[PDB]
Write a protein that binds this ligand. Structure first.
Ligand SMILES: Nc1nc2c(ncn2[C@H]2C[C@H](O)[C@@H](COP(=O)(O)OP(=O)(O)OP(=O)(O)O)O2)c(=O)[nH]1
Length: 848
DNA sequence: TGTACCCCTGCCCGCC
């Protein structure tokens, strides 16, 4: 009747007011975009009186000063007992502050914040004087992520949205308890570009728009869901005219609508109009955030498009004057309103760790198990300004790419997972989709603390885990790997480490503090971490009884995502730029960790058990058993003995290795025993740290390492197994020298963290030279890029891009000398070093 | 206005 109900998704700050973008059900319950403009929000300032003065003394003093300063008729202010438990010195654990409410929008001095160090005769500190509008709203009104909102007193008369409402009382908006959510209008994008040798900038040739008007995150997303619409927007690449027969052939072979334009300006103008109309909640894509959104923005800026703001939901008539590495924030604000669901950004990458480059094709293969052979489209080639079939081919590649981005997006549950994490943290959905962890920690703490009458802080360096020196070599007996479930998170709870409970010297953050006595009640941090580990426990419970393989994978991501979250809770204690940075606390967590790992080793030593290796939270035990169950007895026995030492913290049997080959620290190969339904036990090769597992080692090298390990660890006569390996390698030598191997098996990946320019000794680095050639060719390469290349027949002077090599026309052949020495010999030598009766010279001979 | 979990351990490259 009078209660206006909106489901918020994103926000934006403007003119000292807060704006929420969301979805609304009308009388027929149909869902449309809406934009609320919340006014009358205030900052909760807290003045701290000196020893001898009281909140009353302060009020008498500043309330008139502030009224004059900001020209206010009246200012709400009351005394309030608040607790401080953070790194500042000279702040009492609890005091009577004068809580003052200073509206963000004031008649005068609207943006003159009160400095926290402001001193006076009555007070000496002032908390919460710089807090940001969004924070103040979400905290005061207890909003915990994307949720339904009851908004009373909605003014409709006083954006690219259907509805536009404004409220003058923040108190009017209140969260509902409804856990169901609207359907989301998703619009996947795919943009093809070409570089201009004139200005050295990237221009847009085509854009594909795959709409999915009803995506419900309540129920699961059906696989391969077909879009409710598909539309491509093509521009000429070289000349102003396409090739005769493009339209006809397009509607004959290409899926969905295809509309041709005369120049770019026109194409983008249509694109913007289309966004405004479709008005989607989420924008799917691959490398949107870090490449294509940036390009799109600059082009619209250069071509002087008026409807550029269409990308977002806020109507901007003018471009941010500072536009032209701040483009990050700028673009995020312009997109304010529509969630950017990039599957290849940090958030996406964290859900798909099995990838080495996160190329769209690789991501498709990994997450969907479907193979797609990518096509290198270079619109610089006149092949596309003349041949018509080439053009239709490129467009088709772009359609498939857009479709793949969307599918993978739904497959990895990017939207469902991020939303849930956002509701857990109480921050914004967009921010979580960006791939933040400091933000989700910051906000979960902001809420938990504020809810319990705590003052929140205004807006290597220590020793880590313990890693034992391994018993480097092979262990033919059954080995046990005992692991501590969520070591650090569990430690926090065990010894009750928290901002509120741990005594620490705030004059020296490098001074190790000490666990609090059992008398002290459980703090904030252990409580939240408690809930986190509970959630991961429940998800791993469901994963153990899931029939579908696809759903089980989907659960594995979910549990290691909640794992990342809880671990991040700890990390942010040691994150210098964390709002809740507490070096001493982190220090203490790692400390008790090491202590516990020692005690775990010693406990085994006393039982005359062999501790062959350990890393942070695990220990490996050579039991001297020839069978599984006999080791398992010693395992469960040792388990019972350590669990008695701790209240919450508990060790368990992680894996069992029929045979273990320790190479170094953090590197080893072993044979895991996996039990089946009918008690059947099988063997699987597990590897850690070894060269084969790195991206700088080609697929050939990987296969070689895997075979060598399989036979070496296989129950075969030691000298006979060695023989089998030598022979295998003699054969590989011939295959590589003659060139009887597919070039794809030679490919090497290496991510440049810096720009290829910022590499002084880059002349030696092959990946750098390759990135330089790529850029010259017109390919977008930048910090974070992953470069795939091959050494052909100085090493760096002979390294070329993979795609350039797979072009027979270029006649590029891999250098067998390099790959035999570095890619095959080096790793196998490191694989077999500590193995009995291994001969290094015999190996060197078998190759060169 | 303006982001970004922690530390541990090897392998390149160069130099003292
Ligand atoms: N800050 C931070 N700490 C981590 C991270 N990964 C691991 N750690 C630390 C904290 C963990 O408690 C400890 C154990 O690491 P593990 O990889 O074995 O996973 P964890 O023990 O947390 O869970 P699990 O054994 O799989 O049940 O190492 C991380 O990504 N960030």
């Amino acid at each position: 009747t009078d209660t206006f109900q909106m489901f918020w998704l994103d926000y934006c700050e403007v003119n000292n007011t807060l704006i929420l973008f969301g979805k609304v059900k009308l009388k027929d319950d149909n869902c449309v975009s809406a934009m609320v403009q919340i006014n009358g929000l205030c900052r909760e300032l807290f003045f701290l009186p000196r020893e001898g003065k009281t909140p009353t003394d302060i009020h008498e003093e500043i309330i008139p000063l502030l009224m004059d300063k900001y020209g206010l008729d009246n200012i709400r202010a009351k005394p309030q007992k608040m607790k401080y438990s953070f790194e500042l010195p000279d702040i009492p654990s609890e005091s009577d502050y004068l809580k003052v409410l200073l509206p963000y929008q004031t008649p005068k001095s609207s943006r003159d914040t009160i400095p926290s160090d402001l001193s006076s005769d009555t007070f000496y500190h002032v908390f919460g004087g710089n807090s940001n509008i969004f924070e103040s709203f979400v905290i005061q009104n207890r909003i915990m992520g994307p949720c339904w909102l009851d908004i009373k007193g909605a003014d409709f008369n006083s954006s690219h949205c259907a509805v536009e409402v404004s409220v003058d009382k923040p108190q009017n908006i209140t969260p509902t308890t409804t856990k169901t959510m609207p359907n989301l209008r998703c619009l996947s994008l795919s943009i093809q570009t070409l570089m201009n040798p004139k200005e050295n900038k990237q221009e847009i040739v085509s854009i594909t728009l795959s709409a999915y008007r009803n995506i419900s995150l309540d129920s699961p997303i059906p696989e391969n869901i077909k879009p409710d619409d598909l539309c491509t927007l093509v521009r000429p690449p070289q000349s102003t005219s396409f090739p005769l027969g493009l339209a006809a052939l397009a509607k004959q072979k290409l899926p969905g609508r295809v509309r041709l334009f005369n120049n770019e300006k026109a194409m983008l103008s249509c694109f913007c109009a289309m966004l405004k109309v479709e008005d989607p909640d989420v924008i799917i894509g691959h490398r949107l955030q870090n490449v294509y959104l940036d390009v799109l923005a600059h082009r619209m800026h250069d071509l002087n498009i008026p409807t550029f703001s269409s990308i977002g939901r806020r109507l901007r008539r003018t471009w941010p004057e500072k536009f032209g590495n701040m483009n990050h924030f700028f673009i995020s604000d312009i997109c304010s309103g529509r969630l950017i669901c990039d599957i290849a950004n940090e958030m996406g990458q964290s859900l798909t760790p099995k990838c080495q480059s996160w190329d769209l094709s690789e991501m498709y293969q990994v997450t969907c198990e479907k193979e797609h052979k990518p096509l290198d489209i270079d619109y610089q080639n006149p092949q596309y300004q003349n041949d018509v079939n080439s053009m239709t081919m490129a467009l088709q590649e772009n359609i498939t790419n857009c479709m793949i981005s969307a599918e993978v997006s739904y497959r990895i549950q990017l939207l469902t997972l991020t939303k849930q994490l956002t509701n857990l943290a109480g921050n914004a959905w967009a921010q979580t989709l960006g791939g933040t962890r400091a933000g989700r920690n910051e906000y979960i703490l902001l809420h938990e603390f504020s809810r319990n009458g705590f003052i929140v802080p205004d807006k290597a360096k220590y020793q880590g885990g313990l890693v034992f020196e391994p018993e480097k070599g092979l262990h033919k007996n059954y080995v046990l790997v005992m692991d501590f479930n969520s070591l650090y998170p569990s430690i926090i709870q065990e010894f009750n480490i928290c901002f509120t409970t741990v005594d620490r010297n705030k004059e020296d953050i490098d001074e190790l503090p000490s666990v609090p006595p059992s008398e002290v009640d459980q703090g904030v941090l252990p409580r939240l971490l408690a809930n986190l580990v509970d959630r991961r426990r429940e998800v791993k419970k469901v994963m153990k009884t899931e029939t579908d393989p696809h759903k089980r994978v989907q659960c594995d991501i979910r549990q290691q995502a909640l794992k990342l979250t809880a671990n991040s809770m700890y990390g942010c204690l040691g994150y210098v730029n964390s709002r809740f940075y507490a070096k001493p606390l982190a220090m203490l967590v790692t400390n008790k960790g090491r202590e516990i790992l020692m005690n775990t080793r010693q406990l085994a030593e006393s039982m005359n058990l062999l501790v062959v290796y350990g890393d942070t939270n695990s220990v490996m035990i050579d039991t001297g058993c020839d069978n599984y169950a006999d080791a398992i007895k010693i395992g469960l026995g040792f388990k019972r003995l350590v669990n008695e030492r701790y209240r919450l913290l508990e060790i368990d049997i992680d894996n069992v290795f029929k045979k273990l080959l320790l190479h170094a620290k953090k590197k080893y190969a072993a044979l895991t025993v996996n039990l089946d339904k009918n008690g059947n036990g099988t063997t699987v090769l597990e590897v850690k740290g070894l060269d084969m597992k790195r991206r700088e080692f080609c697929p050939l090298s990987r296969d070689v390492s895997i075979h060598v390990l399989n036979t070496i660890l296989s129950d075969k006569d030691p000298e006979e197994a060695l023989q089998e390996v030598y022979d295998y390698l003699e054969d590989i030598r011939i295959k590589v020298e003659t060139n009887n191997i597919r070039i794809d098996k030679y490919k090497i990946n290496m991510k440049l963290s810096k720009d290829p320019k910022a590499y002084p000794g880059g002349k030696n680095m092959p990946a750098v030279q390759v990135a330089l050639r790529m850029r010259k060719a017109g390919r977008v390469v930048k910090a974070g890029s992953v470069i795939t290349f091959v050494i052909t027949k100085s090493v760096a002077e002979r390294a070329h891009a993979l795609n350039e090599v797979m072009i027979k026309s270029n006649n590029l052949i891999p250098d067998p000398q390099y790959y035999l020495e570095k890619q095959i010999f080096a790793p196998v030598e490191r694989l077999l070093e500590r193995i009995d009766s291994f001969n290094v010279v015999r190996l060197s001979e078998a190759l060169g």
